[PDB]
Amino acid sequence: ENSKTEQVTGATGITQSTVTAPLPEAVSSLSLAPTVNALDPWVYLNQTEVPGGTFTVSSATQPGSVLLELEISPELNLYTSHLFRMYAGWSGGFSLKLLVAGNAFSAGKLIAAIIPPNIEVPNSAYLLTGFPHEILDFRTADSMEIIAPDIKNIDYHFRGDKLGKLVVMVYSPLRSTSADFEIEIKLTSAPLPDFKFTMLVPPIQNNALPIWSIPQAPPYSMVNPRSPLTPVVELYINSSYATCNHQLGRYTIYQGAIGNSTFNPSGAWTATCTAEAGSVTGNPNWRYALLDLPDNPTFDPTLPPVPRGFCDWGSGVKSGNKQHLVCFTGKKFAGGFQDVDAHMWDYGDNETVGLDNTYQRTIYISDPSLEKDAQYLVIPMGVSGAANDDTVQVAPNCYGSWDYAPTVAPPLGEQFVWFRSQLPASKTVNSVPVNVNALMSPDLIRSAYASGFPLGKVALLDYVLFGGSVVRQFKLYPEGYMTANTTGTGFIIPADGYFRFNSWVSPSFMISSVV
Amino acid sequence: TVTAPLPEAVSSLSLAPTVNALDPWVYLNQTEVPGGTFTVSSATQPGSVLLELEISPELNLYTSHLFRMYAGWSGGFSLKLLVAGNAFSAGKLIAAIIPPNIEVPNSAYLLTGFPHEILDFRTADSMEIIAPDIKNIDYHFRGDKLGKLVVMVYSPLRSFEIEIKLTSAPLPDFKFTMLVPPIQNNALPIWSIPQAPPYSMVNPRSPLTPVVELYINSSYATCNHQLGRYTIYQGAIGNSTFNPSGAWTATCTAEAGSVTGNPNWRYALLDLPDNPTFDPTLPPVPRGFCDWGSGVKSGNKQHLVCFTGKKFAGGFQDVDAHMWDYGDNETVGLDNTYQRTIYISDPSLEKDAQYLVIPMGVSGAANDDTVQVAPNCYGSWDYAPTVAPPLGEQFVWFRSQLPASKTVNSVPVNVNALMSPDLIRSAYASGFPLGKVALLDYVLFGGSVVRQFKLYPEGYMTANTTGSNTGFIIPADGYFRFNSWVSPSFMISSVVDLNL
Amino acid sequence: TVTAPLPEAVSSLSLAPTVNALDPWVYLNQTEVPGGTFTVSSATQPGSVLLELEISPELNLYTSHLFRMYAGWSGGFSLKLLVAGNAFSAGKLIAAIIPPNIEVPNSAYLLTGFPHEILDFRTADSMEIIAPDIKNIDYHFRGDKLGKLVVMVYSPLRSTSADFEIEIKLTSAPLPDFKFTMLVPPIQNNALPIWSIPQAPPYSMVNPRSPLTPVVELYINSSYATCNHQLGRYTIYQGAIGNSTFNPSGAWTATCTAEAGSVTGNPNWRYALLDLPDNPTFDPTLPPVPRGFCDWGSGVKSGNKQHLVCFTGKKFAGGFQDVDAHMWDYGDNETVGLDNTYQRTIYISDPSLEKDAQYLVIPMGVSGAANDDTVQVAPNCYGSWDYAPTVAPPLGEQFVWFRSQLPASKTTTTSGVNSVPVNVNALMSPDLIRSAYASGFPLGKVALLDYVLFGGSVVRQFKLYPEGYMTANTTGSNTGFIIPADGYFRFNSWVSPSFMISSVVDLNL
Amino acid sequence: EILDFRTADSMEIIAPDIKNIDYHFRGDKLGKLVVMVYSPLRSFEIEIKLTSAPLPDFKFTMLVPPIQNNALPIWSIPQAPPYSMVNPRSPLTPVVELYINSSYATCNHQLGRYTIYQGAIGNSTFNPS
């Protein structure tokens, strides 16, 4: 441990570089390691940016908010993260350099703390003083090297062990004469000289790659999973769409397709129903039918109540007098379906909340001649009456104990970025022109399964237009949604740019490029 | 030797980044083991585990206080078993040390294959077992798998409940590893109870009426209430709430119809703020709304009573007393059932108009026993389960008096709640040790009289009783104090004699 | 940069029956001092005490926690001063050590007669101060008189150019001679250095000034500079005070014996005396009102314009008969000692009151001209009983209120009683202060609380006083600032009373 | 220290002099021995008594004349029979009997009332006659 001081160019203040070990490192003997694998000597000499190792302190940020929270692991450094795929186990700490863009005419302090494994992080700078910690001042801070121990009770780690953390928060609030001033903080890492790997194994792991390579396909090349016959023509933003309740176009890094979503939305769009006894009260044209369940023959409450991939477009509460969904429908015979034409259809019975506006097995079709217990093709294709983008945007409700996709929202100050397609009318039943949005396309998150996301982190994506004269930035969450930072009805982004991986960020990260 | 059937393997602690020494006097003083108290008698079933303790810093008051400011630990304990038997106590106890990842057998014969010590129930000395820290790691963190002490009957009591308790101290090799701030999620080994008398605690089934009595009734073998239900781990578990008053009031929307046999019994549906899409996995009744019993197929002999009036312009018009009940008084899924459908005995109600409902009494042939048995709960929603006290114990109830109102005429009744939120509020701050019950002293007349109750994590109090009585009363101006942590099957030494 | 204004005298601890060593690592890490956080601003006056601390085990996070299991202690602390200073500020603090039995002065002049150090804002950062353990005895027991550290403004904070504030934190470690004396069970009277609060939302808490109506809002209003309420008053020291109760719902219902005669010039406005179950001897030193009974204001001499509203009905064997709405008020409509006074005499606008008959009283509204403003000022204290003191937030701060909407009761009958819709504010709910009795507050210290909205995305900061109120730092002024009641409180830290919350509420949006 | 009620031996606790001062005067705050039930009697009144001796380090400081305000550890009662004692409610009539009555659950008398600390406490007097 030490500190050195440098005078600033103009002599109007100083910068400090400090090296500290808040907690002693306990160098493992590695006596139980079958082999000890040395790293290339240059890997100890290269400080790379840490995944999620970037935060901005505004004068708004409270001394209660955690700015950075990072596990002490091979994932801290680019080359140890790549190298670890080749190894069964690892041992040893990291040098963690906190680079602070401070200034002598500001005021305020950071605290950085080492937190042992199986201990929770407190939302308080007062409580962080109970840990091994350092305090930095914004007037003089420039570089702080934390010698972060690998805190363990085992000779070396395998995967899936619980790890010590670095935590950074504001100790004392940022002050400046200017309202626009920010302290930018960046964390870099290299393995300590005592860092080792333990056993060569083939480089196939569940653990996420340190860099994600994205195909460079434009959004217009990707399927809209809520309207598969129509191409994506814009990325779209609308500040009133504060939540998503869709069951189609729902994917996650962890679980794959969730809700009633599928990776072949074009081959799943078609369904079949068996036509029931009876019709909706007051509307004898509105014959009931039950969607056929190949996946759910015995109608188990834990498996989906609707066929995999079948339409989740909305029509509002108790609104069949006003608007409907539209489909091609035709009766089943040898080899296919007969007399296929456009009919109005909807979910439920236009009255009861358990059925109406609910994603479940019972539908009505507005055709007066449904034969009882006969099968009918159902290909959803449009909407009719007073229907519009906002009615189609709100899906029918999920219900019961099946594994539906949850309702999701962007963090405060952010907005969802949608994959949007134009769905055309068709005329003599008559449809209306409407725009369909999806939260995500399966063709983007396909690539993300092939690389993985680091646990607890989000992809910051550049979206590149005209080769780079415009670049948008979005956060793609592992929970499936993609999101933008906005200031100030609908807003349109061209669909012929391409996604490029920028970096890993925390869910709490504020995107610097603003839409 | 016999005290150390398995040695303590001293750790080098070479992987510990710091090693923290304890105060030397912590090793020299035995404390009671937090939750190391249990009872045994001739009613104890063969092969039953009497006590099962993980070997950890939680075994001693000083090490459990100290461990709150430490990340990890290493080293065993010396334990002493104190047995409160006498000269007639013919039988044997076995205490065994079980390694991590070993299944505990339900057989004393098999417990002799573990490192063990055997004790006679007549022995007036304490037995001094070493409980070593079994590990393959340099020191522990929180959430590691631990070795156990298992206590079991070796020789049954053939020839009075025998209380047994443990004391402990850490072994001289015990160490504490890394300093951290003193905040942890696990239970305090001592619970400090606010000295608040039961009369100062809300009745959650009758918020407007003070608690006047603690109450015992040998015929109330079960509680089925959806109000007054508070578990230490899950919070308020039924249709229950921590502010009963604020939740007592409801609104309903009037329906066109009337009950099949009577044109005055107009239907309404209760408004559900917390369940707007009427999901059958969520509650079918407003949070905290009245669960008073009105009996099976009883609508012509008794009703519930509410203040009710039409919703209007920032208030309510014409609020006065009316009869009401759940369901239709004929169908087994609506009559006497805790669900959204009610009827009000006012013929006036406009279809789709909204009405106040403030439950305020009962009328006709209603008694304490009818109000005691809440309506049945059915569906896929998270209703509180029906609870019974363990055999030879009775529930202790918070009882309030609900006064009559007269011109609809309501009768005077008593309302019992199983628990008040105001006692269990301090228990959520303090926590409960896993698989333990709180023994509470309830202190009366300056300590001249002291009752004893078990407060379960499942959210109720019991007393141990002799005799039988259909309304024993206890003054509500005493105070609870924490005695100790006990096993769920612990038999209380203070008996409430119900026969007076 | 190490200052000992008075020498530390090392005790031999000869007399101690045991000497208990601390963990060697507790002497090596400086923690924040539990309450040792304070702010200085250009508004902060010369000679103001910013920080007062007893020199005791409570000065450090680990020794405060450890002291819960010890009967006694000896030895001082090494304090370090962390000053979030800036390039433009001038001014001086004075840090003084006061011996155990001596009173703290109220001026810089007298404070300079103690052992002290003067601390300029240009050079005070990372200065170290020995806080010595002054005693004439081998070690302390609990409840002994202790030496103090006092920090005061010596020269006021001034700035060249921009008007900054300075937040100062102390950190501490025990000196090497620090020891504990005797193991006792971990239940001892010193406050825990951390308070842990169960995450109950404000809407899940009772409003003690309107029990039947849920809390819907936390509320702020720049004109509500004073609280004189008797209901909703709780302190960590005393529990419920001034006619408040821990079950406000159960206490809401009174009875009154009807009294002979009626208000002068208003023969419909019959007197009654509230019945006093807890004061049947009618002692002047016990409360003149039933415990937990309504303290709503209804103006001064205001009966022609506005009244309180309740359900009433006469007592019988069968409970209460013919229960319905009436107007009522405290005292007379004229006499200053009775009118707008929290006392036993009421009047009810009911001609039918029989002499010596007992009537139910359930307050549930206000009528006529009554508004939020008039309900907010409680009827006056009067006499020698233990009434709750009138309180204000400190200069530059506002109370945070627990607010509930009280709906209007309407009747369609001619001359039938009619309420107006109103919001009711309480200063505190008993459900928040519940966990503070078990933890304790440190002596002369305030709880800084985070209040957490939107999963952590918005964090209000409030100061919870041990005298039973929350305050916020605010800018602008407004008569209706709303904070959602669906967040939860998280303990942030202990602070001195004069600490200024950094997190300012923009009260005009 | 913990003891079983069956133990026929005596239990030999050291009660140390806890102090932060060199020696005590009268009226100092002192440490205590507290005796309490550890395990309740579940299965006859059990009499318990203490004996003691000072520890070898015990010392007495400064000589003063042998007069003190605190109670003698032995009370010597004059061997006077009750018939020689005045009845304070009937001074002229000798006491003839000591008397017990199970129905006299209370005394409310203002005569014949003498507390050891407050003296004659009611309307009572030491010369009834």
- Name beta bridge partners: C397: C473
Q: In this complex, which of B245, B404, B426 lies closest to C434 when CB atoms are compared?
A: B426
Residue found under tokens 């935060």 = A55
Which H or E element spans position B110? helix B108-111
Task: Please list every residue in chain D whose beta carbon sits closer than 8 Å to the beta carbon of residue C180.
Answer: none
Give CA–CA dist C100/C135, Å, rounded: 7
Q: Does B159 touch chain D (CB under 8 A)?
A: no
CB-CB under 8 Å, A26 with B14: yes
Whether the CB-CB separation of A500 and A485 falls below 8 Å is answered with no
Whether the CB-CB separation of B25 and B477 falls below 8 Å is answered with no
CB-CB under 8 Å, A154 with B15: yes
Chains with at least 3 CB pairs less than 8 angstroms from chain C: A, B, D
Q: Does B124 touch chain D (CB under 8 A)?
A: yes
Q: In this complex, which of A124, A135, A177 lies closest to C82 when CB atoms are compared?
A: A135
CB-CB under 8 Å, A129 with B141: no
Suggest the residue from D20, D21, D28, D57 to mutate for an interface test with chain C (most C CBs closer than 10 A).
Answer: D20
Vertex B366: Cα angle to B365 and B371 (nearest 5): 165
Whether the CB-CB separation of A183 and A61 falls below 8 Å is answered with no
- Name beta bridge partners: B411: B362
CB-CB under 8 Å, B141 with A153: yes
Q: Report the chain B residue with the minimal C-alpha distance to residue C200.
A: B242
Amino acid letter, A363: I
Task: Please list every residue in chain A whose beta carbon sits closer than 8 Å to the beta carbon of residue C84.
Answer: 107-109, 137, 172-173, 175
Whether the CB-CB separation of C389 and C468 falls below 8 Å is answered with no
CB-CB under 8 Å, B179 with C26: yes
Task: Please list every residue in chain B whose beta carbon sits closer than 8 Å to the beta carbon of residue C198.
Answer: 425, 428-429
Q: In this complex, which of C17, C139, C140 lies closest to D16 when CB atoms are compared?
A: C17
DSSP state of A209: P
DSSP state of B74: B
Chain CA centroid to CA A454, Å: 12
Q: Does D16 touch chain C (CB under 8 A)?
A: yes
Q: Does B28 touch chain D (CB under 8 A)?
A: no
Residue found under tokens 């009105």 = B294
Task: Please list every residue in chain D whose beta carbon sits closer than 8 Å to the beta carbon of residue B160.
Answer: 42-43
Suggest the residue from C138, C144, C179 to mutate for an interface test with chain D (most D CBs closer than 10 A).
Answer: C138
Give CA–CA dist A285/A281, Å, rounded: 10
Q: In this complex, which of A105, A109, A123 lies closest to C84 when CB atoms are compared?
A: A109
Range list of β-strands (E), B242-314: 250-258, 266-270, 302-312
Strand-strand pairing, B302-312 and B354-364: antiparallel
Determine whether A74 is exposed, middle or buried from the number of CB atoms within 10 Å of its CB (0-12, 13-18, 19+): buried
Q: Does C201 touch chain B (CB under 8 A)?
A: no
Q: In this structure, how many other beta carbons lie within 10 angstroms of the beta carbon of residue B171?
A: 18
Of C139, C148, C174, nearest in space to C61 by CA: C174
Q: Which tokens belong to B87?
A: 């000269």
Amino acid letter, B13: L
Q: Which tokens belong to D33?
A: 């021995």
Give CA–CA dist A328/A358, Å, rounded: 21
Task: Please list every residue in chain D whose beta carbon sits closer than 8 Å to the beta carbon of residue C140.
Answer: 20
The upper half-sphere exposure of residue C71, i.e. CA atoms within 13 Å in the direction of its Cβ, equals 13
Buried b (16+ CB within 10 A) or exposed e, C349-387: bbeebeeeeebbbbbbbbbbebbbebbbbbbbbbeebeb
Task: Please list every residue in chain C whose beta carbon sits closer than 8 Å to the beta carbon of residue A129.
Answer: 30-32, 61, 171
Q: Does B404 touch chain A (CB under 8 A)?
A: no
Determine whether A313 is exposed, middle or buried from the number of CB atoms within 10 Å of its CB (0-12, 13-18, 19+): buried
Whether the CB-CB separation of C139 and C15 falls below 8 Å is answered with yes
Give CA–CA dist C2/C76, Å, rounded: 14
Q: Does A130 touch chain C (CB under 8 A)?
A: yes
* Longest Cα separation, chain C: 88
Whether the CB-CB separation of C306 and C377 falls below 8 Å is answered with no
Chain CA centroid to CA A105, Å: 39
Q: Does B75 touch chain A (CB under 8 A)?
A: no
Amino acid letter, B210: P
Q: Which tokens belong to A216?
A: 């460079």
Q: In this complex, which of C193, C247, C421 lies closest to B422 when CB atoms are compared?
A: C247
Suggest the residue from A153, A156, A192, A403 to mutate for an interface test with chain B (most B CBs closer than 10 A).
Answer: A153
Whether the CB-CB separation of D98 and D82 falls below 8 Å is answered with yes
The upper half-sphere exposure of residue C496, i.e. CA atoms within 13 Å in the direction of its Cβ, equals 23
Of A122, A59, A124, nearest in space to C494 by CA: A124
CB-CB under 8 Å, B185 with A120: yes
Task: Please list every residue in chain C whose beta carbon sits closer than 8 Å to the beta carbon of residue B24.
Answer: 20-21
Chain B with chain D: Cβ pairs closer than 8 A = 27
**What own/partner pairs with CB < 8 Å and gap ≥ 24 does C100-106 have?**
C100/C134, C100/C135, C100/C144, C100/C145, C100/C146, C100/C147, C101/C145, C104/C49, C104/C52, C104/C148, C104/C150, C106/C47
Give CA–CA dist C447/C464, Å, rounded: 5
CB-CB under 8 Å, D20 with C140: yes
Q: Which tokens belong to B218?
A: 């040998």
Of A176, A5, B455, A294, nearest in space to B463 by CA: B455
Alpha helices in C134-286 (DSSP H): none
- Name beta bridge partners: C234: C240
Task: Please list every residue in chain B whose beta carbon sits closer than 8 Å to the beta carbon of residue A152.
Answer: 15
CB-CB under 8 Å, A127 with C194: yes
Task: Please list every residue in chain A whose beta carbon sits closer than 8 Å to the beta carbon of residue B14.
Answer: 26, 29
Chains with at least 3 CB pairs less than 8 angstroms from chain D: B, C
In order, the DSSP letters of A359-423 are: -SSEEEE--TTPPTT-EEEEEEEEEEET--HHHHHSPPBP-TTS-PPPPB-PPTTEEE-EEEEEE
The four Cα atoms A197, A198, A200, A204 give a dihedral, to 10 degrees, of -70
Buried b (16+ CB within 10 A) or exposed e, A238-269: beebeebbbbbbbbbbeeebbbbbbbebeebb
Buried b (16+ CB within 10 A) or exposed e, A96-130: bbbbbebbbbbbbbbbbbbbbbbbeebbbbbbbbb
- Name beta bridge partners: A290: A274, A362
Task: Please list every residue in chain A whose beta carbon sits closer than 8 Å to the beta carbon of residue B275.
Answer: none
Q: Which tokens belong to A116?
A: 């042992």
Give CA–CA dist D109/D99, Å, rounded: 16
Residue found under tokens 């009366």 = B444
CA dihedral for C391, C392, C393, C398, sign (positive or negative): positive
Q: Does C142 touch chain D (CB under 8 A)?
A: no
Q: Does B71 touch chain A (CB under 8 A)?
A: yes
The whole-angstrom distance between A54's CA and the closest CA on chain C is 18
Whether the CB-CB separation of B62 and C186 falls below 8 Å is answered with yes
CB-CB under 8 Å, A108 with C492: no
DSSP state of C380: B
Task: Please list every residue in chain C whose beta carbon sits closer than 8 Å to the beta carbon of residue B403.
Answer: 319-320
Q: Strand, helix or coil at A76?
A: helix
SS3 content of chain C, % helix, strand, coil (to 5): 5, 40, 55
Method for structure elucidation: cryo-EM
Measured in degrees and rounded to the nearest 5, phi and psi for residue B258 equal -145, 150
Task: Please list every residue in chain A whose beta carbon sits closer than 8 Å to the beta carbon of residue B281.
Answer: 400-401
Q: In this complex, which of C85, C491, C502 lies closest to A173 when CB atoms are compared?
A: C502
Chains with at least 3 CB pairs less than 8 angstroms from chain B: A, C, D
Q: Report the chain D residue with the minimal C-alpha distance to residue C71.
A: D18
Whether the CB-CB separation of B329 and B342 falls below 8 Å is answered with no
Give CA–CA dist A389/A240, Å, rounded: 12
Strand-strand pairing, A251-252 and A256-257: antiparallel
Q: Report the chain D residue with the minimal C-alpha distance to residue C139.
A: D20
Q: Which tokens belong to A368?
A: 């007066």
Number of H helices, E strands in chain B: 6, 28
